[PDB]
Design a protein around this nucleic acid. Structure first.
Lengths: 122, 54, 49, 50
RNA sequence: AAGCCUCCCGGUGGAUGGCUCGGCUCGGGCACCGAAGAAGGGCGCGGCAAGCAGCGAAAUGCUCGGGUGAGGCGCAAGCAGCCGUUGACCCCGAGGUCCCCUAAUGGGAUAUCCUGCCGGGUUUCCGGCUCCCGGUUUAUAACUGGGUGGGAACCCCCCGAACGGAAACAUCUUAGUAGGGGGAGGAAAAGAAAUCAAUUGAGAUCCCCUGAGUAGGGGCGACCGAAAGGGGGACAGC
RNA sequence: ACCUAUCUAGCCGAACUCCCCUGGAACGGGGGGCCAUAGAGGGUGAAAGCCCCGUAGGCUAAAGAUAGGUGGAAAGUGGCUAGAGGUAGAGUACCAUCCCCUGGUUUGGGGGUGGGAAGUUAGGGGACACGUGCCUCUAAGGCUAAAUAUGUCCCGAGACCGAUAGCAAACUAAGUACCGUGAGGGAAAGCUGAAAAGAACCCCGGAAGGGGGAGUGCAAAGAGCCUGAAACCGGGUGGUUAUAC
RNA sequence: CCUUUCGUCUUGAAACACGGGCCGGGGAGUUCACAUCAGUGGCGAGCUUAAGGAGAUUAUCUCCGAAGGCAUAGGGAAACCA
RNA sequence: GGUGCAGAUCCCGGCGGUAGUAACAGCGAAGGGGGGUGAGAAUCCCCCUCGCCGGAAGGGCAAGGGUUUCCCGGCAACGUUCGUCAGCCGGGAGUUAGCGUCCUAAGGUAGGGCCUAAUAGGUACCUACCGAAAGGGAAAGGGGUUAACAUUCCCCUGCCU
RNA sequence: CCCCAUGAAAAGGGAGUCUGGAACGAUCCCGGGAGACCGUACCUAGAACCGACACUGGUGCCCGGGUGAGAAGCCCAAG
RNA sequence: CAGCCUGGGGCCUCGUGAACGCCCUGAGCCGGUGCACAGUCCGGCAUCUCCCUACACCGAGAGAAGACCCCGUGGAGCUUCA
C-alpha cells in the first residue's frame, strides 16, 4: 500500500529515524553461520568480523570496528588508505558487499533477538 | 520645504509603535488604537476578506 | 537614555545580537566562509523596533 | 503568480521604458516575463475522453 | 606601426545538457480547538550556542509502563567530557512541568509591563475578584454554582457596490456576486405539505441528470429565467 | 466490569554474489543455475528478480482510543364496534397602500404603514375578478438519521516542471532581508567525487584552498569545485595593411 | 564585375518616421460550451445513452441502465386542418 | 502538446563602447621638518613649529539610533586615495539613586444607558480610568576613586518620609 | 502702566474652628530601624538623527579679553 | 574698448573611478535624385596613418509617447433657463 513514487521512498532513507537504522546494516551471513544458527541475514554489531566480495580489495577478513548507523556503512581494521601526512584512515565498505564470519555471544540481549526468528532450538 | 527638508523633522516618535499583540511596530498611540493588531476597539482579531490579492 | 523599558527592557530578538558567527562552530561545518545573513548595522539600517 | 498588485508605471515616464507592469520597483505579472502566470495554463477543465 | 579576419589556447561569465529530500494537480481517507487559559505573537534555554526546529526557569528534555535493540549526545565533520548491557538514544501511549502578553477577566497601560483586596498554609508561594442564569444572607453587600475568540475553504442570516453591456445612455442587466456585520459546526441549511395535478392520481426534505433557454419576464435591448413530471442516489420520522 | 473486532508499534517474509572477459568499482558482455502468490519500487562504487530493504501475503500488544455484544433502571400501558359530546395555535390569516426583490406577469414571496377576521357547523388552495358546483390539504410553535459543500491535514496516483519553470518558497531564515510612519509590496540564491583521499612535505611572499614543485585519486575544470557557449579580452597559429571603402 | 539598413505603419512613404549596444535564457490565437460545416467511421427509421447501478486484478475495464434529446410532417393565433 | 523568435522603447542575467574620460575644485583651514612602527607610509604614530575656528568647528543637555562606549588583535571589502588606522571586522567587558513612577488641560477611552438590523458605528447623560522624561509634584552635596558609568560606589557633613 | 486679550486646573501641603474619645504624651530633642520597581553607556550632528551615503538640507535648546553700543566685523583667550 | 594680475578649476602626474547618445563604424565635401534637405544611391572633387588639446558648426546630436490643433459615439471637473 506504501507508495511507489521515487521521491517519497528516497526521503525515508535520507531521514531514517534512529530505531530503524539496523535496516541499512544487515548483511549476509555465511553457510557455516546459518548451519548452526538457522538464519540467513541479521543486523551487524560491533566486535564481529566479516568478509568482502566486491571492490578493489575483495576477499578480506577483518574485524567489525567502525560503523555509520545513521546512513548505514561500516569499516574493518587492517584496511586503510594513507593520507598525505601518513596517518591511516579507515576504508569505508558497505554491508551490501560483505559476508559475516562470526559474532559475539556475550550479550544475552542480542542473543534472544537471534532466538525469536524461529531458529530451531538453540 | 517640499523637497528633502520635508523629511527633516522626521526624528520624533513613530506614530505607530510596538502593539503588544501582532509584533508589528504599528500601534498608533495618537489614535489610541493599533491599525495592525486590531487591539483597541475590536475584541476580535482584525481580519479582512482581502489580506492579499485573491 | 530615557528609553521607557519597552525596548531595552526587552532584550534579545529585540535590542540584542547582530552577532558574529560562533568560531568553533565554523570548524565543525568546515564551511568555506560562515556568515549570519541576518547581519545588520546601525548606520545603514533602521531596526523595525 | 497572480498574488501581486503589480501595475504599469503609466506613460511619459520614459524611465518606465514600456507599459510592462511592475510592483512598486520590480516588474512581474506579465505573461512574457519572469515567474508570472503562464500564457495559457492547462487546467483540469479541459476535455480528456474520446 | 593599428590591426583585420579566421582559427588554437587561456581566463570572464554559467545556458545548454544532465540529477533532484520541492512544489503542482487530482482522486480516497480524515476532518473542531477554546477560562482546566486557545489560536497569535514576545521573551529566554545547551560546556563552548547565532538562526531554525524543539523546548518553558522542571529551557536540547523529567517520570512510568510498551516495542526496540548497541550505540547516542539535531540541523552541523571542532575541543573536551559524559550517558549506554543495572538496557541507552529512538518510537507509542500515559503522565509531570508548562514564563509574559494575548478574547486576557483583580485594577491600570503609547510598558509583552507595573500594581492592589481577600482566604490558604506559610520560607519559597497557592486560590478567587465586564454580561449573564439560577441559590446564601437585609429588603442593593459580599458570598455558592455554569454565554466571550480563533480556525483554509466551505455553511447560515441581515446590509449592500460600482466597472462594464446595451457598440451612446437614463429603465433594465451585469448582481444579491465584490464587500460589510453577526453566528455556528464538521458539515451546515432544510425537513414532515394549508404539497402538488386534473379524471380524480402521487406522497418529507436534499442533491445529481433531464425536463429547458421550455414556461415566463424586459427601452421586447442586451439579457434574465422556473416549476410539474421522469430517471438516479439514500429512501428512516417521532 | 467482561468479551470481540478496529486504530495507535513493530515483526515474518524465496531464490546466485557461480565461471570467463572488460572495467577503479560490476549493477556491464558471454556462459552457467534458481524462486516467483512476492519482477511496485528504492538502495548499494554504473543498467542487479535471485547483494540489501521493501513488495504479495501474513503476524504483533502492556496501555490507551473507537465500535458492537454482554448490563441496569424509570415512565406509559387492553383491542374492536355503534351512538352522543368536546378539542383542534390572532393583530395571525386576509385586505388597501408604499417599498423591496424574484419569470410571477391585471396572478409570487418579504417588510413598513392602516384596517382587519373566521376559527370544526373553521379555513386555505386548485394561473384576472366574482359565483356556482368538484378535488385536495389544516399554518400562524416544535425538533430530526442519512443521501452533498470543502482541503488548514493525512495516505495514493499522475501523457504536471526540472532550478529564470514549477505555488514566492528545493538553499543556513523564507513572508525571511528589505522599501514604506501605514494599511502593504516584496526578493535572490541548488550539483567537490563513492569514499575529503581537502594536496603531507620542500622553495617565494607576510598573508591569502596564493605561486612553484611533489602527492591522493578514473579523472582533478581541488573550494570560485559536473559538464562549461556567446557577447569579451589576452598570447599564439595562418594570411594580411599606412593611396586609400 | 553588381549591390541604399532590419522590422513595421504606410498611396508611396523607410533613407530626415518609429522601435532597434551585443550575447544568452525566458516569452504570445490557447480552454470550454453552443451553433454550423468538412473530413472520417459505426449504425440506420431510427439514432443515442446521459446521469446512474452491479461485477471486476478497481478510476482502465464488462454488463446493465432510453432517463432524455434530435429526426421521424407542415401550416396558422387558435379552435383545428393536415 | 505551455511547442520552433530579432525585435514587442519586451523581461532577466552577463558584458560592450564613449574609457582610465567625468569627477575626487567652488560653501574663505594648511601644513612643514625630524624620529618610530610596520612588508608597504603625503595620509598611522612621537616631537617641535605654524595656520584656522573660537556667541562656534567650544561646553552641556533631548526624541533617535542600540553598543554608535571602552579594552585587546586585525585589514579582502567596507573609508570617495592609501592605510599598520577607524563609528570597520574579529576576541572580551560596561550603566546601580530613601534625595518616571503620582495628579491633571487640551482631550481620550471603557462601561451603564439613547439610537444603529448588526456591528470593530455614533453616542449629548452618568460612572471608572488613560493622558506631560520642559505643567505641578518630600527631601545632598561636597570633595575622592576605575579604560569604560556616577549627585548612586569610598569619607564627612547632612537631609526627608 | 496696559487690556472690548484679564492671562489652567488637580492632586500635594499647612493652618484655623467645633464634636467625640482615652490619659498619656508630642509638629522637641536624644538613641535606634527601614525606605519598592524601573530610567541611568555613548552622540548630538559638516561622520553617531532623518533626508537611500561618512549628505554645505532640516530638527533643537541653553551659556572670556581687547577693539569696539554691541551676541556686528577682526584678532586672540578656554577648548 | 579693451587690458594686467591673484585663488580654485581647468594643464600635467599618482591613486580611485561612472553615466548619454550606439541598426552600423562603412560616415570628407560639393551638385543631383529621391517622402520634395543623404553615410552609403548617381556624378565629380579630393582624401597617408596614428596621437593630444580647443571649439560646439554639423551629425536634420542627445533629454522627454509635443505643453499647442484635431479625432475617439474616451475620461475627469465646473456651471445653468440641458
Amino acid at each position: 500500500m506504501i507508495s511507489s513514487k521515487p521521491s517519497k521512498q528516497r526521503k525515508l532513507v535520507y531521514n531514517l529515524p534512529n530505531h530503524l537504522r539496523y535496516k541499512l546494516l544487515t548483511a549476509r551471513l555465511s553457510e557455516d553461520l546459518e548451519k548452526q544458527y538457522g538464519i540467513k541475514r541479521i543486523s551487524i554489531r560491533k566486535g564481529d568480523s566479516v568478509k568482502l566480495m566486491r571492490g578493489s580489495q575483495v576477499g578480506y577478513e577483518g574485524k567489525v570496528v567502525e560503523v555509520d548507523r545513521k546512513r548505514g556503512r561500516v569499516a574493518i581494521e587492517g584496511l586503510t588508505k594513507k593520507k598525505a601526512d601518513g596517518t591511516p584512515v579507515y576504508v569505508w565498505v558497505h554491508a551490501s558487499k560483505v559476508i559475516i564470519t562470526k559474532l559475539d555471544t556475550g550479550d544475552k540481549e542480542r542473543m534472544d533477538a537471534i532466538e525469536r526468528k524461529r531458529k530451531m532450538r538453540e | 520645504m517640499k523637497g528633502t527638508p520635508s523629511f527633516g523633522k522626521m526624528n520624533k516618535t513613530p506614530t505607530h509603535v510596538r502593539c503588544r499583540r501582532c509584533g508589528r511596530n504599528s500601534f498608533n498611540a495618537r489614535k489610541g488604537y493599533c491599525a495592525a493588531c486590531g487591539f483597541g476597539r475590536s475584541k476580535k482579531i482584525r481580519r479582512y476578506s482581502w489580506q492579499n490579492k485573491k | 537614555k530615557h528609553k521607557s523599558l519597552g525596548k531595552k527592557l526587552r532584550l534579545g530578538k529585540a535590542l540584542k545580537r547582530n552577532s558574529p558567527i560562533p568560531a568553533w562552530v565554523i570548524i565543525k561545518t568546515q564551511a568555506e566562509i560562515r556568515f549570519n545573513p541576518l547581519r545588520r548595522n546601525w548606520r545603514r539600517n533602521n531596526l523595525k523596533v | 503568480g497572480k498574488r501581486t498588485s503589480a501595475l504599469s508605471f503609466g506613460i511619459n515616464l520614459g524611465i518606465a521604458r514600456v507599459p510592462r507592469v511592475k510592483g512598486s520597483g520590480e516588474a512581474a505579472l506579465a505573461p512574457n516575463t519572469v515567474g508570472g502566470r503562464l500564457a495559457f495554463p492547462p487546467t483540469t477543465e479541459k476535455r480528456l475522453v474520446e
